[PDB]
Curated annotation (Swiss-Prot):
Subcellular location: Cytoplasm
Any GO CC annotation of this UniProt entry: cytoplasm
Induction: Repressed by LexA.
Main location group: cytoplasm
UniProt-recorded name of the protein: UPF0291 protein YnzC
Lineage, top ranks: Bacteria, Bacillati, Bacillota, Bacilli, Bacillales
Family of the protein in this entry: Belongs to the UPF0291 family.
Keywords for this protein: Cytoplasm
């Protein structure tokens, strides 16, 4: 699961990725935490 602290961590890493300064380790954690966020999260715009 994910908490606000980890959500900030995601936005941190995402910014690192959008910038290009993100390392492989940061990338690995980013992908995982995004899944921790996707737990139960559905696409409201499509009701998917």
């Amino acid at each position: 699961m994910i908490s606000n602290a980890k959500i900030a961590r995601i936005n941190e890493l995402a910014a690192k990725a959008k910038a290009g300064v993100i390392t492989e380790e940061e990338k690995a954690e980013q992908q995982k935490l995004r899944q921790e966020y996707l737990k139960g999260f559905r696409s409201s715009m499509k009701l998917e």
